Amino acid sequence: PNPKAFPLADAALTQQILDVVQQAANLRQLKKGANEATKTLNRGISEFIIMAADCEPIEILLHLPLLCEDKNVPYVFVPSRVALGRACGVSRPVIAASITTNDASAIKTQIYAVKDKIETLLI
Amino acid sequence: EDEEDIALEFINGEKKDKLVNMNSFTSMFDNIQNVQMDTFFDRVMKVLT
Amino acid sequence: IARVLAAKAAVSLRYDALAEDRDDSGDIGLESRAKVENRLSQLEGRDLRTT
Amino acid sequence: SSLSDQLAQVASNNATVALDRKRRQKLHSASLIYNSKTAATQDYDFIFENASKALEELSQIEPKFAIFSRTLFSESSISLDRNVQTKEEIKDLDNAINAYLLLASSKWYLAPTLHATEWLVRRFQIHVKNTEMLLLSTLNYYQTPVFKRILSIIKLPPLFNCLSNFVRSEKPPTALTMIKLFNDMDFLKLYTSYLDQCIKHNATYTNQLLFTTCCFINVVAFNSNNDEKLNQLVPILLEISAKLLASKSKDCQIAAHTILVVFATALPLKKTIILAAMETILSNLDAKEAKHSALLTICKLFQTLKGQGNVDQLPSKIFKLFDSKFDTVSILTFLDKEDKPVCDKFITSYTRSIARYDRSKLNIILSLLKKIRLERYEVRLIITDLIYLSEILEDKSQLVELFEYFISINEDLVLKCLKSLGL
Amino acid sequence: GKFRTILIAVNAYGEVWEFDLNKNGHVIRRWKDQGGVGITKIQVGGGTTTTCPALQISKIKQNRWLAVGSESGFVNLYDRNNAMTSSTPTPVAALDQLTTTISNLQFSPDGQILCMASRAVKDALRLVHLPSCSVFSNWPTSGTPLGKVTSVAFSPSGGLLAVGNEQGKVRLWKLNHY
Amino acid sequence: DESDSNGDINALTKILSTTYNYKDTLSNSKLLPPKKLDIVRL
Amino acid sequence: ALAEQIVEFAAYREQLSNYLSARMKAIAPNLTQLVGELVGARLIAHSGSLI
Amino acid sequence: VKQHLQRETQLKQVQQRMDAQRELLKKGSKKKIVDSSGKISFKWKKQRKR
């Protein structure tokens, strides 16, 4: 695990995050991939960013925390990109994904719970 | 021991492998140009393993 | 090919402008170039019109 | 059948006879180098001057061609015609054209071949009369502007329809076109005959032998499903594999090796057929490169066969042959290789053959078992062979030594096979 | 006269625990399934199990394969020798053919076919040849009357396969090699 | 022109001439071959 | 004298481009190795900062 | 500045509605669920896109 990928969730928080990811993709609220995630930071709608830790080289996703610091978005590394792709719903390894916003979804409460625990972990 | 144990010894013992699907050798055509014969043969053996 | 090239160029750039301890050998360029090359051979092998 | 269709086949018969001044400019303006108008303005005497010069250049490069200066490139060959000659005479002219195309298939990146074969194109109409030998000769250059030219002139026979689509185009034919040419079958019969003739007159080279290899590989890959297609494509590739082995060029032998390997890992062949594969391979093996390749191949074939009779002895003759061709130190450094191909089945077949046919190199046996990590049933078979050997022979020191090696590894299997036979 | 039984339990995040039962249930080990975000169904095979059981103590054989099946649809497949040795191992093969949540995993009693099936949409049985980890391509076909497969069994001796769906009808095949 | 009259060279071609169905089936193969299943509905 | 001055601009341009290729090889050798250093430098020129 | 802000929020909503429709067009096995309030919504089947 690189010391590159600093704020790293553990087992418990990782499960909760990938649970919200699964729900969000079933409702189609999820943006998959790092280019797509940078786009939605730029448009300024995204709820928060979930990144992998073991995409090697790490830097190709390391371009995201500078945007998240600039724009104040919460962001979390989780340990395995195989798992992130499976929890996300595609057939591929996905190294970053991004929960986008629709204020009257049926998962607004669960998103907020996770986003609040992330922001504690950063802060 | 037993005959059925012997046949399970067969079945357990033999190890996994790669099959020849219909798509393995197609980049051989674009690597074929002037490379020498044995080098081609060893790239083939790599595809098989 | 301009899509595949732009994506692999973004990988190459991000490895370059952010990896603070770079070995200067350009190996990520060489790897991804081999990937784009192989794509080009696959596309140009495909024949749109009947045999 | 219709009057139209019978007339069509008449015109195909008399396809090269200039009956008119218009038709004669059509025929005469098809040419390999020039464009249409220039080619149709010039005449046989000029084209022959250019051709004789080029054949002198090719005779400098390769000295077989003086015979063609004696017999197809003379002033008499200015004079001769192709349509005014009885069938025996035409057959001989096609023998000479076929032998020329062989003995300069290998130089087709050369302007002298372009010029000389252009005289053959125009005076003798090879692009109409014997096109199949034209295309099978110059086939593997399938990107060089020369093959694009040859397609542009030729009229495609009934077995080359894939290119019939690609003819007269700025893009070249592509690899998947070549694979689909070969994936039809009667073409594989045709090409095999061309390679037999090529081998027997000894004009092969790495470029085209690579190409034929890559196409026979790819045919087996696409047919890897339809087991009836595979089973019906066995005799043709295995005929080529035998003849291409029986040659004496190390390039031929490496090509035959790679064909055998791909074909046996795509289809499960019978034990007797893998045995005869080994027999031919070894019995004409000489060179260093082929020795290394052949070793890898035989290991891979024996790994493929699986069933009963899985791990038996080689027969006496094949074993002795293998020993002549391969030293035990050679197989030992092969087992000392870093990469270590999976070769357990051949190793234990070899070991059982040693302990049943030589009964001396048991120190070598312990060396081999130290080197490689066999499997449980191979252990069982080897240990039982040694048990029988002990009960037929004096309890020798090396036989003991093997036994305490197994005692070091798996006392319990020694006990189990002992319960099978003994105490 | 001696065996030893081990109990393997899969967390729905993927963390396998292996207790042993002979001495009181004490954790031999734990290792993580690589990948594996939501796991349903673990099963071992290749030896003696609750699906092909023993008939005298001499016949108990240790299982060679382990399979773990997720509710995305993937199924990771490990070798027991190497997974036990390394204690955070790599799946030998990762199969994704089905697209809904794996709800049955059975090995064949001699351990050469893995049938992975899904409760969730129609005609979702695939039979996998092991060790080469390659799906058999010609049965089940388009017309195989399967329906939403809810349970599967493999016969101990005759080589029979018996599948049962939601309409309530079991259908029965014979793998003719046996 | 033609009559019938260490290890040889002709052997692969000769046994190909002899045998007619070259997939080994008859051998009680003990191992279930890959990618083509053999299954009968009861 | 004008014609020799023309020759000197040609030589100067070749020198500048060789300088630039080596310099891009120093700064972003991955992207250089992928897309070619002229177009790489033009990318950097347009968007400004490498970052 | 305030009027700019309301223009932006309204365009945001129009793009929300349009984006939901585009993805109804795409694929999948949808389900049309109906809320209490009158608002409808769609919920896709649990399946992996291949």
Swiss-Prot record, chain C:
Subcellular location: Nucleus, Nucleolus
Function, in words: Required for pre-18S rRNA processing. May bind microtubules.
Similarity comment: family membership: Belongs to the NOP5/NOP56 family.
Additional notes on this entry: Present with 34700 molecules/cell in log phase SD medium.
Oligomer and partners: Interacts with SIK1/NOP56 and NOP1. Interacts with the trimethylguanosine synthase TGS1. Component of the ribosomal small subunit (SSU) processome composed of at least 40 protein subunits and snoRNA U3.
The protein's name: Nucleolar protein 58
UniProtKB/Swiss-Prot annotation, chain D:
Binding partners and assembly: Interacts with snoRNA U3. Interacts with MPP10. Component of the ribosomal small subunit (SSU) processome composed of at least 40 protein subunits and snoRNA U3. In the absence of snoRNA3, forms a complex with other t-UTPs. This complex can associate with pre-18S ribosomal RNAs.
Homology family: Belongs to the HEATR1/UTP10 family.
Residues bearing PTM N-acetylserine: S1
Cell compartments where the protein resides: Nucleus, Nucleolus; Mitochondrion
Annotated coiled-coil segments of the chain: none
Name of protein: U3 small nucleolar RNA-associated protein 10
Portion held of the full protein: 2 to 424 of 1769
Role played: Involved in nucleolar processing of pre-18S ribosomal RNA. Required for optimal pre-ribosomal RNA transcription by RNA polymerase I together with a subset of U3 proteins required for transcription (t-UTPs). Involved in ribosome biosynthesis.
Misc. remarks from the entry: Present with 18200 molecules/cell in log phase SD medium.
From Swiss-Prot, chain E:
Signal peptide extent: none
Domain of life: Eukaryota
Compartment(s) of residence: Nucleus, Nucleolus
Ranges for the WD repeats: 47-88, 97-138, 144-177
Complex and partners: Interacts with snoRNA U3. Interacts with MPP10, UTP21 and UTP25. Component of the ribosomal small subunit (SSU) processome composed of at least 40 protein subunits and snoRNA U3.
Similarity comment text for this entry: Belongs to the WD repeat UTP18 family.
Note, other: Present with 9570 molecules/cell in log phase SD medium.
Main function: Involved in nucleolar processing of pre-18S ribosomal RNA and ribosome assembly.
The name this protein goes by in its record: U3 small nucleolar RNA-associated protein 18
Organism of origin: Saccharomyces cerevisiae (strain ATCC 204508 / S288c) (Baker's yeast)
Phylogenetic placement of the source organism: Eukaryota, Fungi, Dikarya, Ascomycota, Saccharomycotina
Gene that specifies this protein: UTP18
Residues of the whole record sequence present: 417 to 594 of 594
UniProtKB/Swiss-Prot annotation, chain H:
Protein name: U3 small nucleolar RNA-associated protein 11
Naturally occurring in which organism (per UniProt): Saccharomyces cerevisiae (strain ATCC 204508 / S288c)
Whole-protein residues included: 201 to 250 of 250
Record function comment: Involved in nucleolar processing of pre-18S ribosomal RNA.
Region (Disordered): 19-50
Superkingdom, natural source: Eukaryota
Compartments where located: Nucleus, Nucleolus
Protein family: Belongs to the UTP11 family.
Oligomeric form and interacting partners: Component of the ribosomal small subunit (SSU) processome composed of at least 40 protein subunits and snoRNA U3. Interacts with snoRNA U3. Interacts with EBP2, FAF1, MPP10, RPS16A and RRP14.
